Amino acid sequence: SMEDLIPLVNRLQDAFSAIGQNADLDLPQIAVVGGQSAGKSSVLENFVGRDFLPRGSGIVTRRPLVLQLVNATTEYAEFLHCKGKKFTDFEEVRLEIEAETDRVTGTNKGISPVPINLRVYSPHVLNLTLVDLPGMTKVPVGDQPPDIEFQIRDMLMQFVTKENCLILAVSPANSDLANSDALKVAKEVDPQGQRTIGVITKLDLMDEGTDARDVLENKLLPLRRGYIGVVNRSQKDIDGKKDITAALAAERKFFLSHPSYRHLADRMGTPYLQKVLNQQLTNHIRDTLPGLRNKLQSQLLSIEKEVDEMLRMYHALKEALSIIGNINTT
Amino acid sequence: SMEDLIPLVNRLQDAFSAIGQNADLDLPQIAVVGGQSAGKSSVLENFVGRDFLPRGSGIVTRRPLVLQLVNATTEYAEFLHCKGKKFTDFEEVRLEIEAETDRVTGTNKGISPVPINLRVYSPHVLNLTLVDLPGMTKVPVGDQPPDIEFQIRDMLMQFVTKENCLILAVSPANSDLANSDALKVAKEVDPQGQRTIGVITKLDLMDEGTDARDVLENKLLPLRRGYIGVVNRSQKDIDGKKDITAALAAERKFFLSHPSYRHLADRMGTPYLQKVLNQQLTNHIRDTLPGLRNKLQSQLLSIEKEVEEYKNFRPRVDEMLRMYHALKEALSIIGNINTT
């Protein structure tokens, strides 16, 4: 179904452009937040469906990465800071992000508030904006300033305070949920949980004799949108270049076999997280369309009853309305 | 060995009692700080040498436990709130701590700043004050107030602000050290690191492909006194009643077999942390002795001449003799301590 909606939405956005009006679906942006090493970058790139974000132990993401997915015929990527070049090898994209980070922050744990801008072109994506962010901390290391914690907090606040921004509150299972930096920030900016999606990672690392059932069932710390558990690649896995299909296969096996979670399998995992996020995106689209539809109808009526040689407007509006109708039918 | 100093020290504090002076030997108060579930209660009871602190997953320690070790030959324990009762079964002590907590906090995650006073009598301990505290958190659960983080923080602050408080900054290895609540707290109250000891737990739970070598080698986040790693019992271990000896054996085996920690094995483990903590305690005592000795000498010398004439010339004021002997006794004990 998603494969049918995506191409229609791109057509509608183009149609709006032809109309030359300040009207857009205003798709919400996706931001990932949480304590350092919570597993944020893994979560984000999994949603996009490509291995391109630097991941590792310790401090990895040291600058915000503003990613704009752009629907296009060709599949490639390009950074704003690299005018001209078109990356087709995503490993090179990952390497470039790292290199661009080191260039500005150095290699002694430093951080920078300056975003790395990346556009990923593909015909199977929504024109979305996703933001990868540095993890929250408590004490400075290397050459970080004494107030590193607040410099990072400020950094993510500028993204998560944006209206409608979908907040991926990432928390590792091998730590008590009550210590979640992700949830604390989420509750400050979105207290009612209207745009917070709880994500519990590292389920495979829990101490023997423990499990996150109460968390995953949305009972330990209830969230309006609930919680979705995932099991991503470990350091040994990253070191060994384990591929995505294999990681996803291991995650699926994990939920189907674990005695504390198999009854929840159908609501756990990376693929299911993708569906949940895509659903929230679809909900925004369908919720925003009626207002636009009516506006376009009003604009059309004027020219329609009157039917400057600007006859194009009639067809442009007519086109947009035809697309909306198709979307409403899916 | 430490078991040599202990007997001497108690006799010293007793000698001062006979003299009616300030026994002193103001030993530092040891407190465990860290995020919720960092493994504080395990570390604390491991140092005491007995299993009696409630440990488990989720929120366990919901009230401060001010524990006073009291040297005594009978070896037992008594709670201030259990007037007239003395426990001999430390497991019953553990149950009581939990029961007493439930009585005031309920069973729905609630906490209370009202400390639980407990005294453990044993001939293998120094008159110390240990403080078990609730783990720091960020978001409330159950019927905890929305300011749970600060109530817990304030609870700890009442103990760790004291100049004479030895801070055991506990942080689990399977979490990033830079995000440690224990280290944030410790740095705020003791920036120089004069009374902070970094304890790293759960090294056995680290992700495959990672290790805490840089941490344990005092290189990632250097502390004045460094770090000591330990491997305590897991939840499964608690459920299975795994005994202390087995846990200790597994911990030692862990450091000796791990390629990243092998060369550090001799500066790692619970027995080592016990030694290090004991060293700081002993050092405090030794720093205090010169002052006490001098004070005693001055007092002695005064009556010394009076005793001299009493034993040599023709004949109650014999309170002097009692004092003479008590003072002599104390100085001798100090002398014995000085020679270790």
Ligand SMILES: Nc1nc2c(ncn2[C@@H]2O[C@H](COP(=O)(O)OP(=O)(O)CP(=O)(O)O)[C@@H](O)[C@H]2O)c(=O)[nH]1
């Ligand atoms: N076992 C296991 N390891 C995981 C899981 N998710 C992430 N990791 C590991 O945790 C570490 C952090 O991964 P990463 O995706 O970079 O988290 P991040 O929060 O983006 C890191 P930073 O906060 O520095 O940007 C890596 O070593 C990765 O292999 C998981 O579900 N299971």
Ligand SMILES: Nc1nc2c(ncn2[C@@H]2O[C@H](COP(=O)(O)OP(=O)(O)CP(=O)(O)O)[C@@H](O)[C@H]2O)c(=O)[nH]1
């Ligand atoms: N595998 C493993 N588990 C550990 C280790 N230390 C503690 N745990 C586990 O962590 C949990 C918490 O232990 P606890 O000693 O209560 O930590 P605490 O910080 O005192 C808990 P609170 O903050 O509620 O008081 C228990 O399930 C225990 O088995 C360790 O070194 N290894």
Ligand SMILES: [Mg+2]
């Ligand atoms: Mg990251």
Ligand SMILES: [Mg+2]
């Ligand atoms: Mg405890």
